[PDB]
Amino acid sequence: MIFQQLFESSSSTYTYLLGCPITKTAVLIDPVLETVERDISILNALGLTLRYTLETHIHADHLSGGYQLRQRTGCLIALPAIEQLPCADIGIEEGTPLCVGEVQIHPLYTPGHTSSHHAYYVDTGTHLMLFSGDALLIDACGRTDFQAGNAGQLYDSIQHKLFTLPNETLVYPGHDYEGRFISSIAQEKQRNPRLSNNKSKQAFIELMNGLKTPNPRKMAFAVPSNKQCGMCPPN
Amino acid sequence: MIFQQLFESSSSTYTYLLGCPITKTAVLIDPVLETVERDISILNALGLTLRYTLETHIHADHLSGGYQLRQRTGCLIALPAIEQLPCADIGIEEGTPLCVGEVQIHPLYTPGHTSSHHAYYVDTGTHLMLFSGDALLIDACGRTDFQAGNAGQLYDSIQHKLFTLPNETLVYPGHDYEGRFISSIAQEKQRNPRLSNNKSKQAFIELMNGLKTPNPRKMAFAVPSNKQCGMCPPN
Ligand SMILES: [Fe+3]
Ligand SMILES: [Fe+3]
C-alpha cells in the first residue's frame, strides 16, 4: 500500500496519504486547506487519483482541504455520519469500512475531544496503523476544554478503543508540536504522561482540567467552515 | 508477517520476533539470555519453529541467547561474517538476504558503535522496518567510547546507510532507556538532538566525546561470551 505522512507547519497537522497500487486510487486523511496544492502535486507525481478525503473530526485549528480537493479532483468527502452534514458525501461509522481499492479503512468511534471524533485503522498484513486523530497524541492527547470536550469520555475512548489494540499497533497522530511522527500503542501505555502507570479516570480528569492553553486562533471560523466541509465564510 | 517487539528490562534490549505465517518459521533478532524461556514460550504459543537467531553486533551489555536457543530448538545462529566467529552457523553480509520463509531480511553494514555492527531492514509491502541495533537509537545513538568506538565512522554509517532510507521507514532500535519503542527516519532527521539540523560531523564527534556514561556492568564477560555466541564462561 502506498503511504505518505505529510505535515502542515502552521497548524502542526499531519495529513495521511494512502494509495492502492492496483487501482491507482487514494484517500487523504485530514487534508489541510493551506496544503491543497502540495497534496495534488504529490498525487500527480505518484499517478494516483484522489477518490476520498476523510476527516477524523470537525477541526477547530485549521480549515479542511476537502471542499477545495473535491472541486479540483471530484473526490468524495467522507466524515462522521453522526454530524449529519449535507455537504459530505459519505457518512463514516464504526463497523462499516471505507474501501479505497484493496485498502480497507476501519473507523473507531473515539469521542471526547469532540463529540463525533473518529479514529481509523488499517491492517497492512504486518502492522495495524492507527490514525488516532486528536484522541491519542504522542505523549499527550487532544485537549478537552472545548465546548463539547469531555475528559472522562476521552479517557473511555482511549482505554476502550485504542489501548485494547495490540502492542505493536502504529500510532499516527493528528498533530505534533515537537517533531515526533509516530508512536506505538505499547509506547503510549508505557510512558504517555497523561495515561501511564494505570492513571485512573479521576486523576486524568484533574490533570486535563489543570491545563491552561490559549484557544486556537482560528477556532471562530474553522469549526463552522468545517461543518461546511471547508467552505470559507463570506466574512 | 508475524511481528513482535520484546523488551528485557535488565539491559533494556529489544528482541524482535519475525515469523512467516505460511512456513511457520521464525527468526529472533538480538535474543537475550535472561529471556530465553519467554522467547521459547512465545514461539510455541504462536506455533512457530525457530529457524535463525540474528545478532546486530557483539553485545557488550548482555549475553546473547543464541547459544542456548540453538541447544533447545536446533536453530542456526547468524551474525556478521566479518567477526569470523567459529560458533556461528551463518555469516551475515550486506547484499545477501537472510531468508525466513517468504520474509527477506536485508543486512546493512553500519559500523561505529563496533566495527562489525550490522542493521537489518524488512519490507512489509507498506513499510520498510529498520532494525537499527545500536547504530541509530531513538533521540540518541550508540555509545562510541568502547575500543572500536568510532564517532566519525558511526556518523557516516547513519548518514549514508540509514538517513537515505525513505521518510516513513520505521526505526526499531536495539535499546531504549526511556520507554520508547519506535521512531521513523523522518522523525530522527527532524529532532534527534545528536543528528538533527544537519549537525556537522565535527560537531557530532565533539558531542560524542563529551558524553560520559558508565560502562555496562557485564562488559568484561559479555563480549568474550558473545564471541562464543552467548556461551557462558566457566568461571
Ligand atoms: Fe482537533
Ligand atoms: Fe551495543
Residue numbers in the entry:
A (entry chain B), B (entry chain A): 1 to 235
Text taken from the publication that reported this structure:
Oxidation of sulfane sulfur can also be carried out by persulfide dioxygenase (PDO) from the superfamily of metallo-β-lactamase enzymes. However, PDO does not oxidize elemental sulfur directly because its direct substrate is glutathione persulfide (GSSH). Here, we report the first structure of a recombinant PDO obtained for a representative from a group of colorless filamentous sulfur bacteria, Beggiatoa leptomitoformis, and provide a comparative structural and biochemical characterization with known PDOs. Thus, it was shown that B. leptomitoformis uses PDO to oxidize endogenous sulfur.
